[PDB]
Short mmCIF file of all heavy atoms in Angstrom, two decimals:
data_model
loop_
_atom_site.label_atom_id
_atom_site.label_comp_id
_atom_site.label_asym_id
_atom_site.label_seq_id
_atom_site.Cartn_x
_atom_site.Cartn_y
_atom_site.Cartn_z
N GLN A 1 0.75 -1.18 0.00
CA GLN A 1 -0.01 0.00 -0.01
C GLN A 1 0.82 1.23 -0.03
O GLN A 1 0.47 2.30 -0.51
CB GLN A 1 -1.06 0.08 1.14
CG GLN A 1 -2.43 -0.48 0.85
CD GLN A 1 -3.48 0.51 1.14
OE1 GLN A 1 -3.17 1.61 1.75
NE2 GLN A 1 -4.78 0.24 0.87
N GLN A 2 2.04 1.25 0.53
CA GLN A 2 2.98 2.29 0.64
C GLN A 2 3.50 2.70 -0.84
O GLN A 2 3.77 3.82 -1.10
CB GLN A 2 4.20 2.12 1.58
CG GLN A 2 3.80 2.14 3.05
CD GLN A 2 3.11 3.49 3.34
OE1 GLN A 2 3.77 4.50 3.47
NE2 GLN A 2 1.79 3.52 3.49
N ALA A 3 3.52 1.70 -1.73
CA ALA A 3 3.88 1.81 -3.13
C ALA A 3 5.36 2.18 -3.27
O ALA A 3 5.77 3.22 -3.91
CB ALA A 3 3.03 2.91 -3.76
N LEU A 4 6.24 1.23 -2.81
CA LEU A 4 7.60 1.40 -2.84
C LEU A 4 8.15 1.50 -4.30
O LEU A 4 7.93 0.57 -5.04
CB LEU A 4 8.41 0.31 -2.09
CG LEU A 4 8.10 0.27 -0.58
CD1 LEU A 4 8.80 -0.81 0.04
CD2 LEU A 4 8.40 1.63 0.08
N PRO A 5 8.90 2.52 -4.60
CA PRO A 5 9.64 2.52 -5.90
C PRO A 5 10.89 1.65 -5.79
O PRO A 5 11.63 1.70 -4.89
CB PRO A 5 10.06 4.04 -6.06
CG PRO A 5 9.30 4.77 -5.12
CD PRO A 5 9.11 3.84 -3.99
N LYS A 6 11.09 0.77 -6.87
CA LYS A 6 12.28 -0.07 -7.06
C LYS A 6 13.53 0.77 -7.05
O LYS A 6 14.59 0.35 -6.54
CB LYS A 6 12.10 -0.87 -8.35
CG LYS A 6 13.28 -1.92 -8.52
CD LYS A 6 13.08 -2.66 -9.86
CE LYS A 6 14.22 -3.53 -10.26
NZ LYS A 6 13.95 -4.93 -9.84
N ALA A 7 13.44 1.92 -7.71
CA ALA A 7 14.51 2.84 -7.87
C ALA A 7 15.15 3.33 -6.51
O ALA A 7 16.39 3.46 -6.45
CB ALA A 7 14.13 4.11 -8.65
N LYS A 8 14.38 3.43 -5.55
CA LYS A 8 14.79 4.02 -4.23
C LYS A 8 15.48 3.01 -3.34
O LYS A 8 16.14 3.47 -2.39
CB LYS A 8 13.59 4.56 -3.47
CG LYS A 8 12.68 5.61 -4.18
CD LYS A 8 13.25 7.01 -4.10
CE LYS A 8 12.09 7.93 -4.57
NZ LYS A 8 12.55 9.37 -4.79
N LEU A 9 15.39 1.76 -3.61
CA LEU A 9 15.95 0.70 -2.74
C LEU A 9 17.41 0.90 -2.32
O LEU A 9 17.83 0.64 -1.16
CB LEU A 9 15.69 -0.66 -3.29
CG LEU A 9 14.35 -1.27 -3.18
CD1 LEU A 9 14.13 -2.56 -3.98
CD2 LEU A 9 14.03 -1.71 -1.67
N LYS A 10 18.24 1.27 -3.21
CA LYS A 10 19.68 1.56 -3.05
C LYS A 10 19.95 2.72 -2.12
O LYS A 10 20.90 2.59 -1.38
CB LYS A 10 20.34 1.81 -4.40
CG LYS A 10 21.80 2.21 -4.42
CD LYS A 10 22.40 2.18 -5.77
CE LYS A 10 23.83 2.73 -5.82
NZ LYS A 10 23.81 4.32 -5.92
N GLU A 11 19.05 3.71 -2.09
CA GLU A 11 19.13 4.75 -1.18
C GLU A 11 18.78 4.34 0.27
O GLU A 11 19.54 4.52 1.20
CB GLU A 11 18.22 5.92 -1.46
CG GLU A 11 18.25 6.50 -2.83
CD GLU A 11 17.30 7.65 -3.06
OE1 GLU A 11 16.47 7.89 -2.15
OE2 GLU A 11 17.19 8.22 -4.13
N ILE A 12 17.69 3.64 0.39
CA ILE A 12 17.24 3.05 1.70
C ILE A 12 18.24 2.25 2.42
O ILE A 12 18.47 2.42 3.54
CB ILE A 12 15.91 2.21 1.43
CG1 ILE A 12 14.79 3.10 0.81
CG2 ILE A 12 15.46 1.61 2.75
CD1 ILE A 12 14.62 4.44 1.43
N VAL A 13 18.80 1.26 1.71
CA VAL A 13 19.81 0.42 2.30
C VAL A 13 21.04 1.26 2.68
O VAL A 13 21.60 1.14 3.76
CB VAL A 13 20.25 -0.74 1.31
CG1 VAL A 13 21.39 -1.48 1.91
CG2 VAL A 13 19.05 -1.53 1.09
N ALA A 14 21.50 2.18 1.75
CA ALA A 14 22.64 3.10 2.02
C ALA A 14 22.50 3.83 3.29
O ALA A 14 23.52 4.08 4.04
CB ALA A 14 22.69 4.02 0.83
N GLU A 15 21.34 4.34 3.63
CA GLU A 15 21.15 5.13 4.84
C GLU A 15 20.41 4.42 5.98
O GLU A 15 19.93 4.99 6.93
CB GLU A 15 20.31 6.41 4.44
CG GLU A 15 18.80 6.05 3.98
CD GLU A 15 18.26 7.31 3.23
OE1 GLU A 15 18.90 7.96 2.38
OE2 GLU A 15 17.03 7.57 3.37
N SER A 16 20.49 2.99 5.93
CA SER A 16 19.98 2.13 6.97
C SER A 16 21.13 1.92 8.06
O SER A 16 22.30 2.25 7.84
CB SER A 16 19.49 0.85 6.48
OG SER A 16 20.66 0.06 6.02
N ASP A 17 20.67 1.30 9.11
CA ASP A 17 21.59 0.88 10.21
C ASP A 17 22.10 -0.53 10.11
O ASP A 17 22.62 -1.10 11.04
CB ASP A 17 20.96 1.10 11.55
CG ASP A 17 20.91 2.56 11.94
OD1 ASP A 17 21.86 3.08 12.45
OD2 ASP A 17 19.81 3.12 11.85
N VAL A 18 21.97 -1.15 8.86
CA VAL A 18 22.29 -2.51 8.67
C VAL A 18 23.79 -2.71 8.85
O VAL A 18 24.50 -1.85 8.41
CB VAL A 18 21.88 -3.12 7.36
CG1 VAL A 18 22.55 -2.41 6.23
CG2 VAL A 18 21.95 -4.65 7.31
N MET A 19 24.21 -3.87 9.24
CA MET A 19 25.65 -4.16 9.47
C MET A 19 25.91 -5.71 9.29
O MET A 19 25.21 -6.53 9.81
CB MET A 19 26.12 -3.76 10.81
CG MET A 19 26.28 -2.34 11.03
SD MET A 19 27.84 -1.83 11.70
CE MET A 19 27.78 -0.13 11.42
N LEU A 20 26.92 -6.07 8.52
CA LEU A 20 27.36 -7.45 8.38
C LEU A 20 28.30 -7.78 9.43
O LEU A 20 29.01 -6.93 9.99
CB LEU A 20 28.00 -7.65 6.96
CG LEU A 20 26.98 -7.48 5.84
CD1 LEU A 20 27.79 -7.64 4.54
CD2 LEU A 20 25.77 -8.47 5.79
N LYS A 21 28.35 -9.07 9.83
CA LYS A 21 29.10 -9.48 10.95
C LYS A 21 30.62 -9.28 10.69
O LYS A 21 31.08 -9.12 9.57
CB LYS A 21 28.94 -10.97 11.32
CG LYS A 21 27.56 -11.29 11.87
CD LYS A 21 27.50 -12.64 12.59
CE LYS A 21 26.30 -12.82 13.46
NZ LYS A 21 25.19 -13.33 12.73
N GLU A 22 31.36 -9.14 11.78
CA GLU A 22 32.85 -8.90 11.67
C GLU A 22 33.40 -10.06 10.94
O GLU A 22 33.15 -11.20 11.18
CB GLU A 22 33.36 -8.74 13.06
CG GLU A 22 34.71 -8.04 13.09
CD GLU A 22 35.06 -7.49 14.42
OE1 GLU A 22 34.97 -8.33 15.37
OE2 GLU A 22 35.34 -6.31 14.61
N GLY A 23 34.39 -9.71 10.00
CA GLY A 23 35.09 -10.74 9.20
C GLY A 23 34.53 -11.16 7.88
O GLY A 23 34.95 -12.00 7.20
N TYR A 24 33.35 -10.50 7.48
CA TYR A 24 32.64 -10.79 6.22
C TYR A 24 33.42 -10.69 4.97
O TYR A 24 33.31 -11.51 4.06
CB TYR A 24 31.29 -9.96 6.13
CG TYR A 24 31.52 -8.57 5.74
CD1 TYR A 24 31.51 -8.22 4.38
CD2 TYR A 24 31.75 -7.58 6.66
CE1 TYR A 24 31.86 -6.89 4.03
CE2 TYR A 24 31.86 -6.25 6.28
CZ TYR A 24 32.00 -5.91 4.97
OH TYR A 24 32.12 -4.60 4.69
N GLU A 25 34.37 -9.71 4.89
CA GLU A 25 35.21 -9.58 3.78
C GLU A 25 35.95 -10.84 3.51
O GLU A 25 35.95 -11.43 2.41
CB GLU A 25 36.16 -8.41 3.79
CG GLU A 25 35.45 -7.07 4.04
CD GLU A 25 35.35 -6.72 5.55
OE1 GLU A 25 35.12 -7.57 6.44
OE2 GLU A 25 35.53 -5.50 5.89
N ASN A 26 36.68 -11.35 4.51
CA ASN A 26 37.47 -12.56 4.42
C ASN A 26 36.65 -13.75 4.11
O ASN A 26 36.99 -14.50 3.23
CB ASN A 26 38.19 -12.78 5.80
CG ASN A 26 39.53 -13.56 5.66
OD1 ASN A 26 39.55 -14.71 6.01
ND2 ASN A 26 40.46 -12.89 5.24
N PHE A 27 35.41 -13.78 4.73
CA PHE A 27 34.42 -14.94 4.36
C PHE A 27 34.24 -14.92 2.86
O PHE A 27 34.62 -15.90 2.16
CB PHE A 27 33.27 -14.63 5.29
CG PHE A 27 32.23 -15.77 5.14
CD1 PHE A 27 32.48 -16.96 5.73
CD2 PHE A 27 31.00 -15.63 4.45
CE1 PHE A 27 31.47 -18.02 5.77
CE2 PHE A 27 30.02 -16.66 4.49
CZ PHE A 27 30.36 -17.85 5.11
N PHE A 28 33.52 -13.84 2.34
CA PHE A 28 33.14 -13.86 0.93
C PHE A 28 34.25 -13.93 -0.03
O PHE A 28 34.08 -14.65 -1.07
CB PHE A 28 32.25 -12.69 0.70
CG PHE A 28 30.86 -12.87 1.17
CD1 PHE A 28 30.39 -12.30 2.42
CD2 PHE A 28 29.93 -13.55 0.51
CE1 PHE A 28 29.22 -12.38 2.87
CE2 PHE A 28 28.68 -13.73 0.96
CZ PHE A 28 28.27 -13.23 2.19
N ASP A 29 35.40 -13.37 0.23
CA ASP A 29 36.50 -13.23 -0.64
C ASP A 29 37.25 -14.60 -0.80
O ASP A 29 37.55 -15.02 -1.91
CB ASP A 29 37.54 -12.13 -0.30
CG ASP A 29 36.95 -10.76 -0.47
OD1 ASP A 29 35.81 -10.62 -0.93
OD2 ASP A 29 37.61 -9.80 -0.03
N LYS A 30 37.39 -15.36 0.19
CA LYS A 30 38.01 -16.65 0.28
C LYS A 30 37.13 -17.65 -0.49
O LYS A 30 37.66 -18.36 -1.38
CB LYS A 30 38.32 -17.19 1.68
CG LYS A 30 39.56 -16.55 2.30
CD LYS A 30 40.84 -17.28 2.05
CE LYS A 30 40.99 -18.57 2.84
NZ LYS A 30 42.26 -19.34 2.52
N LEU A 31 35.89 -17.58 -0.23
CA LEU A 31 34.92 -18.42 -0.89
C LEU A 31 34.91 -18.12 -2.49
O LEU A 31 34.77 -19.04 -3.22
CB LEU A 31 33.59 -18.28 -0.33
CG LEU A 31 33.47 -18.86 1.15
CD1 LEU A 31 32.21 -18.36 1.88
CD2 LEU A 31 33.53 -20.40 1.14
N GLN A 32 34.94 -16.85 -2.81
CA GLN A 32 35.03 -16.47 -4.31
C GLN A 32 36.34 -16.96 -4.98
O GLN A 32 36.23 -17.52 -6.04
CB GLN A 32 34.78 -14.94 -4.47
CG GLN A 32 35.21 -14.38 -5.81
CD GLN A 32 34.53 -15.03 -7.02
OE1 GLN A 32 33.61 -15.83 -6.95
NE2 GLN A 32 35.00 -14.66 -8.22
#
């Protein structure tokens, strides 16, 4: 009902308080 624009999603995440756990770079990079 709020009618979220797909375009705005990158802004919302950018200005959120979300945080990945400590060490995530090493995790994903080694696996890649």
Side-chain angles (χ1 to χ4, degrees):
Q1 264 234 359
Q2 289 304 281
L4 297 179
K6 187 185 173 92
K8 306 272 193 196
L9 281 167
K10 176 168 170 277
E11 304 180 0
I12 299 318
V13 175
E15 65 200 39
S16 73
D17 284 284
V18 68
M19 290 230 167
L20 296 175
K21 290 198 164 87
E22 198 161 54
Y24 74 90
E25 304 91 324
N26 208 251
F27 188 72
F28 282 98
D29 294 354
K30 283 271 280 177
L31 293 163
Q32 161 59 5

